């Protein structure tokens, strides 16, 4: 007996409740993942004078949190186009911007860079109340975060260290007991459960920066990508423990990492190519697809069923199909391109970039909502000397 995969059976069975199965779940979403990219249209938002958006996640069907190079943390109501700023959490001590935002699997805790970029800030969801202090575990900025459980998060940094943090019930109850007594919010205290550095390779021993993290829930692995071109895999069942290290086929701008749970494949961005790695495979068994957007860099990547969505410095999003092993074509690779957003004609632009009226808004972050039909895209100009933001909702 062959597998019944036809969507006509799903529709006609649904009309009868004739066991329209959960078997079709991968058919329905896989079909949508191929259809959506050509149906999307841009609705830009005006964020004012914020510097760049570096991280973003959906908090609700209606709201997206965004972190910025200005260190501002803010929320967009994408239905009303309304911007709400959030207080930035300070450290245990009275001593860049927000390069990473992450949600724990149960969506009760949000993890961001703090007022100190070296320090992890935790907020309570959905309210955005503070939970705990900015720490002093890292000596430099937090580049990436990954919630390996509802209580445990790993955080990378420019010094190459990986802090493992656990928000225990005590941390929550101390935050809540303190906020009920003191009208001014007072944090709970935190420290890393363990602090481990990535193995130092023959490459520059200071350039051990861990730029991206991704969690494989199936095997309880944490994958990690450094900017020296090396990929690392760690077991994350209970505590951060090394499994293997593999050198990536490309060692340039390895800034984003995503994991396809339906493929057991890690997608790794680079200055030009997306690489598809499987740590259980031989090191030569790696697929590499060239974006051809050469010189602009891949800046964000994610899996939607069997489709990879790739944001780039050419302010453009490509879509790639694993099963077909090629880009989606337009109804000639299909690509969206961001609008102009807003640029600040500041002194640096005046001196070095004044000869250019328009720059592409690099997609530093993108994410699909829970329905799988809306794609939030945000970023800013590629050059570090340029100040100005871009955001919009594609639907």
């Amino acid at each position: 007996p062959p597998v019944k995969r036809s969507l006509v059976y799903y529709l006609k069975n649904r009309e009868v409740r004739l066991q329209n199965e959960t078997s079709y779940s991968r058919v329905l979403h896989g079909y949508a993942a191929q259809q959506l990219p050509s149906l999307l249209k841009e609705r830009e938002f005006h964020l004012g004078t914020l510097n760049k958006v570096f991280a973003s996640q959906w908090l609700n069907h209606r709201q997206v949190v965004c972190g910025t190079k200005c260190n501002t943390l803010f929320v967009v109501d994408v239905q009303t186009s309304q911007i709400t700023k959030i207080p930035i959490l300070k450290d245990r001590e009275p001593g860049c911007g927000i390069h990473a935002i992450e949600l724990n699997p149960s969506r009760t805790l949000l993890a961001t860079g703090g007022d100190n970029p070296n320090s992890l800030a935790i907020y309570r969801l959905p309210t955005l109340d503070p939970v705990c202090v900015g720490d002093d575990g890292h000596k430099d900025w937090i580049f990436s975060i990954a919630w390996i459980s509802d209580t445990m998060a790993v955080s990378g940094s420019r010094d190459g260290s990986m802090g493992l943090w656990e928000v225990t019930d005590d941390v929550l109850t101390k935050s809540d007991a303190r906020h009920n007594v003191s009208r001014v919010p007072v944090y709970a205290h935190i420290t890393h459960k363990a602090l481990k550095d990535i193995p130092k390779e023959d490459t520059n021993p200071d350039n051990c920066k861990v730029r991206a993290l991704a969690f494989n829930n199936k095997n309880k692995e944490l994958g990690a990508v450094s900017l020296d071109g090396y990929f690392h895999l760690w077991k994350a069942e209970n505590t951060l423990s090394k499994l293997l290290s593999t050198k990536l086929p490309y060692c340039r701008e390895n800034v984003c990492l995503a994991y396809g749970s339906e493929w057991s494949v890690y997608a790794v961005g680079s200055q030009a190519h997306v690489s598809f790695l499987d740590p259980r495979q031989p090191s030569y068994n790696v697929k590499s697809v060239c974006s051809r957007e050469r010189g602009s860099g891949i800046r964000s990547v994610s899996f939607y069923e069997h489709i990879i969505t790739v944001g780039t410095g050419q302010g453009s999003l490509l879509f790639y199909d694993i099963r077909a092993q090629r880009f989606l074509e337009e109804r000639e690779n299909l690509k969206l391109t961001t609008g102009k957003g807003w640029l600040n004609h500041d002194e640096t632009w005046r001196n070095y970039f004044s000869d250019i009226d328009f720059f592409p808004n690099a997609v530093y972050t993108h994410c699909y909502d829970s329905s799988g039909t809306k794609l939030f895209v945000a970023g800013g100009p590629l050059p570090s000397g340029l100040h100005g933001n871009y955001a919009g909702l594609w639907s």
């Binding site: 570096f54 190079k69 390069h99 900025w141 580049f143 701008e253 860099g297 590629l382 050059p383 570090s384």
Partner: peptide, 5 residues
């Protein structure tokens, strides 16, 4: 082309 971090 002064990429961010």
């Amino acid at each position: 082309g002064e990429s961010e971090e």
